[PDB]
RNA sequence: UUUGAUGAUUCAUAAUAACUUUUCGAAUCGCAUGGCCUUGUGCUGGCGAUGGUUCAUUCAAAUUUCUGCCCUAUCAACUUUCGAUGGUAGGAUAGUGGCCUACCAUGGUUUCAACGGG
RNA sequence: AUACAGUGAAACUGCGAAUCAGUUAUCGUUUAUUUGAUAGCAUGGUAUAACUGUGGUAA
């Protein structure tokens, strides 16, 4: 059957082909989700503890398995001592980087001093010749305008109480004439 | 497509008024019997407002048959201006454009309603400012430059008096404001040709003591002409502005010329300026001068530039002008030639300091002869260490006078250093590393606080018994600078027999583990070095773990694996490894400034020998953010109080202030010992976060 | 002499007591960003976009009172069969309400053209 | 415009997808929407889309 093969930290993925068909004698009837040994499975990799993903079985559909299952699929839970060839070696960055302020305050340790606004990742796009670089957000940061708009509620809500209980005393006054007319 | 919605801000932004670049064919080339009424009774079809409807309905008897106009002048005239004070805005362009109209039919007669018509044309622009409308500004902008193109004819002497009437609107601190009059302005002074434009100048100058912006707009705005075009009258206002120039004005007069020579020069392109060079070329021949030449020579006939350079110079500044030369220059004769006159040029060592940050280039003949010719400014200057250009600092570093190096030789052979004079030998080995047996006497007696110690490392980096005695002195024992000794001293037998003799090396392979990265790379790069002069897969390991530090998604995604790697070979596979491994551990872990790394370190201290320094080194990190470490060494004062030769500009403006904070850090002794304390490693950090 | 009314109220509304698998009382956005002077980096402040508690309005739905249409006595009896028709409670209901449950009652319709059929 | 600032595909979110006839009441119901009133912590965490990749599959 092909087995793709991604080990998480650098996050690569590759497929292999597993011919021996009694090392894929010991994934059958097991549940999605359990603990696959390196060395127990198969011949060369070593010590690489796995968990099996199910998925889809021939022409791709979807607890116990059976051999329909012909891309099976694996993560690398824990590394043996096995140096793969495209997994381990070559590494793949992690592709979009923290968005948030305090994302980015717990991804590189920020303080409540630091108000970031240059720890923000950074990216030069290159066209070839003019080079371009973007600085993309921090979102959900404080800024100016949002306690400027805290103020302004602050604002209406203490104008609209001292709007109306005071309208309140100007009708008392007339029902207080009207009192004194009967 | 349509609906884009602009803001206010947004419309005026938008704004430029150049009526008479404006081209359609309005009313006014259509003439009835009056000029005026053509334009009255279209605006009293086309638009609808109360009190333009009862004005109409005041001055129907009379706005016809022109005659009718000429009797009733002033009654009219008193109408229109009484319901531009009353100001609805919806009526506000046919009673403005009708007082636009009101001047063109007349002309002379005008001028006794002209200053009143003024008044209440201000008093409605802050009417329109607090209005918030740019149509409204569009026309009553509009309807003043009318007035001025009518009245250009009789508006030539009388210049001073309308510029002295319109000034709240120059000096009104609400920059738009300015920028639409300057044009208006900027057009009359397009209009008057020569002595009038020469008294209004030295006036314009004379009254400069938010203005100053205002004069720049109004000096542009008289030179803009079309796209990549100058203005046909430009090189006589240029005339004009270097005449009401060279010291007839005041001090922020010359920046003002400057500032409109230097929007000049970026709106015009490369042919619409000969004719301006030519004028402030023949302007400059006779003999302030300095910040016109900077200014020019900013925006890039550079030999007639050094021709008359050098007739001015024979008779800071000049050290600006020297830098921008050399910085756009294109001859080597004219380089060799400013060498000539930098032998005459004082402050040397901040011109070519601003001049090395600039670039780097031939013609470093001038530097020997300086260094020779010979305190402060030169410790400075040896003390900017690793640049681009230490290729040639550390060529030419041996062209200095020598007898000031066995100079200091002397005062470095005897030190009774207490406080400062250990500061004062710091000065003189940061000059005597570009000048072995002194220095070791010298540190002997010194060793006999952390920056004294951390300058004495570093002439003994510039410096086996010189290695015995350092051995013997770290033996004893900032430590940045003495890793960097230890470490010149290791890669710059008896040596191995030396080694041998001291026991050492397990007090810095356990503090290898700082708040600092630079002091952890220091530290494991000395370990290897005295562990080669005297195992290493998993120090190259750590080594190069730590060597790929630039936290760039790609390098940090790199890093988690590399660190988990080498933490596997060395928990999987001696006590020295053992607490070199665990020192780097510890280091990664408090470095946090990389949640990448904190994660690796997180899994590497999972299969450790147990409690073998782990839980020591834990308590040893949180008991390391209960209180936290200061107090480095202090200094006197000193005062520049200097280094201005610019007020405002875009760009010009922040060259300047780069070169004045040169000139500020090559200031008096005491700023350069407080910039060289100032100029260290890193320290101890992080509270709160380890 | 204390209170808002309709034809009409356990109506509108206010007070206590606790229950709330604890509802809401803005972790929101655009344009300007002006002021107070103890110039902090403070405190303030405009226009309006969304949201949101309750009431009213508006637009609706879903039921409900009164009349009607195809021919017939070679259709005179029809509905309480395994709900028929009420009353009492409960459940369902968004609710009045056999829409249903049990309990109490044995009703109700009809020669008037009903009931059934064309 | 070194957080952001122009246009902006994709995607999330938000919004919207026998007729019976005349005929009264809803003090028997709800009333999305519009409209008008209406309520005295410098602001934290998920769990993911588009996308990058590994495939199956005639599809």
Same mark, same amino acid.
């Given at each position: 059957m092909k087995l793709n093969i991604?080990?998480? $930290?650098?996050?690569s993925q590759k497929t292999f082909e597993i011919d021996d068909e009694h090392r894929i004698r010991v994934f059958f009837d097991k549940r999605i989700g359990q603990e696959v040994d390196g060395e127990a499975v198969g011949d060369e990799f070593k010590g690489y503890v796995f968990k099996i993903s199910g998925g889809n079985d021939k022409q791709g559909f979807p607890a116990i $398995?059976?051999?329909?299952?012909?891309?099976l699929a694996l993560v690398i839970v824990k590394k043996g001592e096995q140096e793969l060839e495209g997994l381990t070696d070559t590494t793949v960055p992690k592709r979009l980087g923290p968005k948030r302020a305090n994302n980015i305050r717990k991804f590189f340790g920020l303080s409540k001093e630091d108000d970031v606004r240059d720890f923000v990742i950074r990216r030069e796009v290159t066209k070839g010749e003019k080079t371009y670089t973007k600085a993309p957000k921090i979102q959900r940061l404080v800024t100016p305008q949002r306690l400027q708009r805290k103020r302004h509620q602050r604002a209406l809500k203490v104008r609209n109480a001292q709007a109306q209980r005071e309208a309140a005393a100007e009708y008392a006054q007339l029902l207080a004439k009207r009192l004194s007319e009967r | 497509k349509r609906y884009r919605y602009s803001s206010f801000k947004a419309r005026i932004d938008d704004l430029k008024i150049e009526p008479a670049r404006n081209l359609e064919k309005r009313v006014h080339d259509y003439v009835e019997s009056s000029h005026f009424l053509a334009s009255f009774d279209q605006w009293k079809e086309i638009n609808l407002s109360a009190k333009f409807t009862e004005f109409a309905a005041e001055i129907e008897h009379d706005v016809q048959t022109l005659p009718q106009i000429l009797y009733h002048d002033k009654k009219i005239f008193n109408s229109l201006v009484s319901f531009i004070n009353f100001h609805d805005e919806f009526s506000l362009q046919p009673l403005l454009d009708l007082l636009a109209q009101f001047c063109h039919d007349l002309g002379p007669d005008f001028l006794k309603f002209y200053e009143e018509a003024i008044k209440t044309l201000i008093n409605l622009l802050d009417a329109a400012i607090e209005f918030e409308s740019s149509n409204v500004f569009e026309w009553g902008f509009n309807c003043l430059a009318y007035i001025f193109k009518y009245l250009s004819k009789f508006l030539v002497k009388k210049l001073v008096l309308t510029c002295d009437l319109l000034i709240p609107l120059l000096s009104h601190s609400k920059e738009y404001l300015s920028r639409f009059s300057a044009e208006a302005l900027s057009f009359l002074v397009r209009k008057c040709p020569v002595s009038n434009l020469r008294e209004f100048v030295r006036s314009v100058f004379e009254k400069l003591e938010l203005y100053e912006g205002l004069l720049i707009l109004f000096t542009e705005s008289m030179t803009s002409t079309q796209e990549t075009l100058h203005s046909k009258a430009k090189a006589i206002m240029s005339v004009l502005l270097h005449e009401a120039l060279t010291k007839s004005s005041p001090e922020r007069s010359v920046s003002l010329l400057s500032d409109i020579w230097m929007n000049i020069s970026k709106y015009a392109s490369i042919e619409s300026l000969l004719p301006v060079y030519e004028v402030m070329y023949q302007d400059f021949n006779d003999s302030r001068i300095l910040k016109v030449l900077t200014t020019i020579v900013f925006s890039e006939i550079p030999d007639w530039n050094k021709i008359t350079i050098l007739i001015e110079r024979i008779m800071l500044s000049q050290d600006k002008v020297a830098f921008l030369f050399a910085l756009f220059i294109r001859n080597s004769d004219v380089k060799t030639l400013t060498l000539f006159h930098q032998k005459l040029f004082n402050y040397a060592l901040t011109n070519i300091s601003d001049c090395f940050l600039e670039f780097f280039q031939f013609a470093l003949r001038l530097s020997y002869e300086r260094v020779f010719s010979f305190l402060f400014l030169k410790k400075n200057w040896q003390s900017?260490?690793?640049?681009?250009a230490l290729f040639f600092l550390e060529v030419d570093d041996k062209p200095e006078l020598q007898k000031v190096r066995e100079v200091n030789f002397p005062e470095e052979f005897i030190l009774s250093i207490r406080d400062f004079f250990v500061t004062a030998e710091i000065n003189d080995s940061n000059d005597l590393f570009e000048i072995i047996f002194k220095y070791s006497k010298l540190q002997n007696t010194e060793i006999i606080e952390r920056i004294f110690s951390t300058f004495a490392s570093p002439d003994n980096f510039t410096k086996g018994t010189l290695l015995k005695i350092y051995r013997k002195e770290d033996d004893a024992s900032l430590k940045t600078i003495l890793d960097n000794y230890e470490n010149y001293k290791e890669s710059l037998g008896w040596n191995k027999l030396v080694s041998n003799l001291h026991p050492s090396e397990s007090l810095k392979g356990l503090m290898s583990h700082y708040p600092s990265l630079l002091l952890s790379l220091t530290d494991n790069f000395m370990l290897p070095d005295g562990k080669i002069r005297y195992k290493t897969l998993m120090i190259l390991q750590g080594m190069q773990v730590p060597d790929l530090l630039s936290s760039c998604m790609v390098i940090e995604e790199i890093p988690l694996t590399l660190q988990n790697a080498r933490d596997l070979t060395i928990r999987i596979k001696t006590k020295t490894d053992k607490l070199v491994s665990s020192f780097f551990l510890k280091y990664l872990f408090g470095l946090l400034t990389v949640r990448f790394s904190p994660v690796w370190t997180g899994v590497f201290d999972t299969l450790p020998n147990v409690y073998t320094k782990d839980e020591a080194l834990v308590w040893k990190l949180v008991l390391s953010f209960i209180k936290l470490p200061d107090e480095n060494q202090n200094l006197d004062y000193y005062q520049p109080l200097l280094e201005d030769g610019a007020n405002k500009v875009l760009w010009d403006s922040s060259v300047v202030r780069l070169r004045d904070t040169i000139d500020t850090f090559s200031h008096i002794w005491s700023k350069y010992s407080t910039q060289n304390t100032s100029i260290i490693s890193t320290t101890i950090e992080r509270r709160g976060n380890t």
């Open positions: 991604s080990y998480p $930290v650098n996050g $398995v059976g051999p329909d299952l012909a891309v | 900017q260490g690793k640049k681009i």
